[PDB]
Design a protein around this ligand. Structure first.
Ligand SMILES: NC(=O)c1ncn([C@@H]2O[C@H](COP(=O)(O)O)[C@@H](O)[C@H]2O)c1/N=C/N[C@@H]1O[C@H](COP(=O)(O)O)[C@@H](O)[C@H]1O
Length: 246
């Protein structure tokens, strides 16, 4: 499924080049109508990142997120700055379908295993956003991608598989926000290694052909952010492409 994404800094829709907070482009302070148009084009799930919160969990945009989730009638997943079990509970209570977590899942595995026990694996998406080095190590980034964690994608997948891990969002950070194309080889590999996980591809989609290029990877979701903000194609066109390649 196509998963349109919005990223938010202090109420403003933005695109960050490779997630670099010093490299923003602005797309207005009206995310709700934007999402509603996505949903009207047929979007089945929507993705929101609270970039203000990912950088400083003290400054999460909790009121805005609540308004956006309540303002559409399709499932919304939300990430950025979640740190506690109470954070997760509050998002789910406000109608969020799935809570997307990266930092704390790397930093405090015993704690997050407890979250899996309380909320169930259907309610949690593990974000494993990676900088892939020259040797091929898929190093997971945390703290709004500002920190390189020293831990691989695969180590973290194996950490949570025994407590029922089912949803993983995997961004190739080098592609994020660049329109350069998504990392097809990355998803081919990880999807095959972990057929029991529903992977969401993320970062780099630049045109309809880039979506089509993912058809054989086995990913269950295709996140698209920048290309939709720039109008490279419509959500309806993206959905048509994915329906068809499947
Ligand atoms: N610096 C960052 O940009 C960043 N930092 C954290 N995140 C997300 O925050 C959440 C993790 O937050 P913590 O739990 O670590 O606080 C996860 O959702 C991470 O992906 C970040 N993700 C931002 N944007 C994503 O980048 C991709 C861009 O796609 P494109 O436009 O089509 O090219 C899409 O998946 C966008 O949603």
């Amino acid at each position: 499924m196509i998963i349109p994404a919005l990223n938010l800094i202090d109420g403003t829709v933005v695109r960050l080049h490779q997630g670099d907070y010093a490299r923003q482009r602005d797309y207005g302070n009206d995310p709700l109508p934007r999402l509603q148009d996505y949903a009207a084009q047929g979007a089945g799930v929507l993705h929101l990142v609270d970039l203000t919160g990912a950088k400083d969990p003290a400054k999460r945009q909790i009121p805005l997120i609540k308004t956006l989730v309540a303002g559409v009638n399709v499932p919304v997943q939300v990430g950025g700055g979640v740190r506690t079990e109470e954070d997760v509970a509050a998002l789910l209570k406000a109608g969020v379908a799935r809570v997307v977590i990266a930092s704390t899942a790397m930093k405090s595995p015993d704690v997050v295993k407890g979250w899996f026990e309380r909320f169930g694996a259907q309610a949690l998406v593990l974000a494993l956003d990676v900088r892939i080095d020259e040797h091929g190590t898929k190093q997971v980034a945390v703290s709004g991608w500002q920190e390189n964690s020293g831990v691989s994608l695969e180590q973290l997948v194996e950490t949570y598989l025994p407590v029922g891990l089912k949803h993983v969002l995997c961004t190739d950070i080098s592609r994020a926000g660049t329109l350069a194309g998504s990392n097809v080889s990355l998803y081919e590999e990880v999807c095959a290694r972990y057929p029991q996980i529903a992977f969401q591809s993320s970062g780099g989609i630049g045109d309809i052909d880039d979506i089509a290029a993912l058809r054989g990877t086995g990913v269950r979701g295709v996140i698209v952010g920048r290309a939709l903000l720039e109008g490279k194609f419509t959500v309806k066109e993206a959905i048509q492409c994915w329906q068809n390649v499947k």
